[PDB]
Amino acid sequence: CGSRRKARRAHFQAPSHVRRVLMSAPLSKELRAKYNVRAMPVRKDDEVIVKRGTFKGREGKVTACYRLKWVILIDKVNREKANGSTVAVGIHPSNVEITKLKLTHHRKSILERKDRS
Amino acid sequence: PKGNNAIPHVHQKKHWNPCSSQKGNVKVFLNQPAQKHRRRRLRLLKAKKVFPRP
Amino acid sequence: THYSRKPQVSSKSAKAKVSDLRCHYKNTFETANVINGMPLRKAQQLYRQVLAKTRCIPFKRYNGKIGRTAQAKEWGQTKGRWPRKSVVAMMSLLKNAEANAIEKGLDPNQMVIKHVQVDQAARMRRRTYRAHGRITPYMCSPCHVQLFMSEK
Amino acid sequence: RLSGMNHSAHSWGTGRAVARIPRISGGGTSTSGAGAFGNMCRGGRMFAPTKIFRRWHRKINLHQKRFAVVSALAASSVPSLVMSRGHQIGNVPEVPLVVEDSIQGYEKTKEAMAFLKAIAAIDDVNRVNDSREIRAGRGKMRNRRYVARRGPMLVMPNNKGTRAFRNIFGLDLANVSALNLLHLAPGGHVGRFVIWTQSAFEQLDKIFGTFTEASAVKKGFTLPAPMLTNTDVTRIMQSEEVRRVLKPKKLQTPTNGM
RNA sequence: GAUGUGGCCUGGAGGUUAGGACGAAGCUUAUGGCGUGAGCCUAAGAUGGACCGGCCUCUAGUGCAGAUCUUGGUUGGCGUAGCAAAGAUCUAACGGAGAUAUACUCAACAUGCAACGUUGGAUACUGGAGCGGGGAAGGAUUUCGUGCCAACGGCACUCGUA
RNA sequence: UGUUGGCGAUGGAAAUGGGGUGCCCCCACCCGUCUUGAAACACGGACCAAGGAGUCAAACAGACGCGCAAGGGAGGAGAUAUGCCA
RNA sequence: AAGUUUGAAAAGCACUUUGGAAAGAGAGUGAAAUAGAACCUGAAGUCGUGACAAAGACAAUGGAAGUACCUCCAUUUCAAC
RNA sequence: GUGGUUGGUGCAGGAGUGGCGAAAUUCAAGAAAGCAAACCCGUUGCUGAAUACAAUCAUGGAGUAUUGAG
RNA sequence: AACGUGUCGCGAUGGAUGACUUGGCUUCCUAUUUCGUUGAAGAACGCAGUAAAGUGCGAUAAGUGGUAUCAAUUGCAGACAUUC
Ligand SMILES: [Mg+2]
Ligand SMILES: [Mg+2]
Ligand SMILES: [Mg+2]
Ligand SMILES: [Mg+2]
Ligand SMILES: [Mg+2]
Ligand SMILES: [Mg+2]
Ligand SMILES: [Mg+2]
Ligand SMILES: [Mg+2]
Ligand SMILES: [Mg+2]
Ligand SMILES: [Mg+2]
Ligand SMILES: [Mg+2]
Ligand SMILES: [Mg+2]
Ligand SMILES: [Mg+2]
Ligand SMILES: [Mg+2]
Ligand SMILES: [Mg+2]
Ligand SMILES: [Mg+2]
Ligand SMILES: [Mg+2]
Ligand SMILES: [Mg+2]
Ligand SMILES: [Mg+2]
């Protein structure tokens, strides 16, 4: 929208099925060549790698897309607490990069739908 | 010290101004270009509908 | 959380603090200001003797229309008092600072108080009732206290 | 119209030792007995509240508008005034810059940018690109977030062929049949940089008329006559005719006395 | 009282020229320099953490010491005036962090004061128009047991209609 | 318009201007107000922050800027560029 | 009346130790704790503390001109002016 | 011959509404900073290798910034 | 001497300023646009594994059915993907 007020209100009051699309990540060069698609919505059990931040260069499997805090959680991305127990750190999906897709029938249908050829 | 002025007859002694106690009696023309655009659009649509009649 | 002054040598000093005491600020000001340059054992003895009422605390700034006594001649004044509620809290503060020094490994028999500062804290509010349907404030005035002592 | 005045406040009079201002009625809240109805009171009414029948628009004489457009067009052909306004025209072939009419068949922005680089308007386009930033002040909260300079303007004979140029940042497109003074003199300063297409250039004379012949579009309009035939007064001041009549030049502490 | 000023200052708009994470705005000053002045500019911050200056035009909810001015905070008086109707409590043993709390010398006093609950004993008061036992109007969980003691019970609490 | 000394040899220097605090000699009634007249025994006046008062419209006139001129100028509406563009 | 406006992320202070507890002293997270829970910045007014200057028998404040002491200020010079 | 504005039965398109649906750097450098006086020469020349700093000793976020290519 | 006075460095109390803004105010437009005895607007009492207010709902009660979508929701618990 050509109104900053309306645009920001829509973004911050988006429902769950809209946040799913808003939280998308790009694909690697290999997958971009294979599927002719530039980016996909992130999903649990995908494989990503971090391109920005203090965890840049780490790779792991996605364990949660919280969607209320606008973050995804990655199993290898974690830090310690005071009492020595481990907690996960949330990353924004546009800072990561998908390297392997969890493929299902509907997901392949979506990829065929979004194919640019 | 009223010098040599005209004798005024400005005629504004009723409650025309809207304030905290009065609704007012005024008419502004701020919708003039919008209404002109609307009228022209309607005329073009009507001509298209009744074609070929004038 | 730092103090208004710092010790010369920080490995031979100890510190203590209280934030919102719930003792009268004007009484604790006097009770704490009197031990500023004294050795620790001297300060503790003075507090015990004030509780026993054989010595007094000199009132020097906030002393408007208080009574005169003969125990104030020792400090060059004529007015003094025996505030037990403030004395028994300064005793606890001194005990804490001594424990800190002992943990650092110093000798409590050689420490000298070098810094004392008392300040006003936020004020709580109650109310009182006057003639003709009036209501008027009834406030509590607490204090902050901080101190450090160094080894001689 | 109702703001600041939505209470039932009254004055308490004298006798009670408070100032005589309307005060909010009732009890049980912190707002009870507080000042009301005044530019000086918190929550009160502003001095002279603003109305919607202020004069927002203005009337201008048709002849004066036409005069202003003509003057801005004339100023856009003096290369020093363009430089003073602020354009980068150092490597431009000529002023006024007229270009062939085959640029109306372009279909890709790559071709359009190649044409701009060949004509050497790219320096001013780059000035505009490099100037972009976020505005200072409250304006960026009110849908006015970004600012940039003004670049060259390209005039076409009709509304055809703009597809390749529409997206280039820092270039503005105009139609010769309706020229805007707000664009011919941004900020009120004359001297815009204009790139003319040949067809629009040949239409200018029919649109505006000449000093003797009248316009075919603006009915009965002719260019204004000049107050000075030759505007160079230093040459007159230094001429021989004046110097023959100038007046000839001429050649140019105790106090007591006793 | 009138008028002038390429006279100073504040929020926004059209232009133009510039600055900023190698640190913007804001804030501090025995930081000087400039100007008759309104004011402008530099320095330092052992302050701050993301925006903003100059010039030409345009525009306005545009400059505060005082109105028994409005809202919020503070302050001397001041540890002061007072907290005086309804007679009054004492003692031992238990309980409790609320003690029998020391640098040593030293038997002990002259260096841990003051105040609290329960039980027993003593001494008083109410005095049947009662600080007795039940109800209406009004109140609506204040009732009971176990805990707790930050705030409230204008002194205090280990106790409470909290 | 020259001449002769002192200090200054690259420093924690010397000098000259600012700034700060104390002292001496001299000078000096408390602000705002109304009033013929206020330092007044005439009214308002404990401190600080933020707010706080000649504005908008309409009729007329005079001076100054600009366009045209025995003429000047609309308004309302229409037409098509126009379907970013009030 | 009343912006929960800590921080990029709770990583929201494990453990030692004095205290009945609230808390204090260390240690740690974090770019910052001088960001420690209503926690961005953090003004004026008022108060505490350390150092220093004097002097309150002319209420203080104020003006003009010097001097004593200080000066995290500026400028100039250093062997030719 | 006409009537979809007599009624009963069938079945078409369009508009409106709702879903789907586009390009191109996470590019290189960890002084990641400058100068060569309108334009060009310049796709080229030459400027340090730093550690400073903090009222003997240790200590000191995220590249949408900069620069160059595309 | 003490108390008082003045200047500077550090610290409290207090909550201004600046930066931010899912809010207000004002102006325009579009249309198969206008409630109720077939019981409305308003008012009351309830409903979650955990649930005071608010929000949603009505003993089928933080919801049943149908379409579309596609893997969550999250303080803690608990549990057809060719879409149960
Ligand atoms: Mg008269
Ligand atoms: Mg007269
Ligand atoms: Mg009213
Ligand atoms: Mg008395
Ligand atoms: Mg009373
Ligand atoms: Mg009463
Ligand atoms: Mg475009
Ligand atoms: Mg404004
Ligand atoms: Mg000062
Ligand atoms: Mg105003
Ligand atoms: Mg008394
Ligand atoms: Mg009494
Ligand atoms: Mg009495
Ligand atoms: Mg009796
Ligand atoms: Mg009787
Ligand atoms: Mg009490
Ligand atoms: Mg009980
Ligand atoms: Mg803060
Ligand atoms: Mg003395």
Ligand code: NA
């Ligand atoms: Na208001």
Ligand code: NA
């Ligand atoms: Na003010």
Ligand code: NA
């Ligand atoms: Na009594």
Ligand code: NA
């Ligand atoms: Na007056």
Ligand code: NA
């Ligand atoms: Na006077």
Ligand code: NA
């Ligand atoms: Na890179």
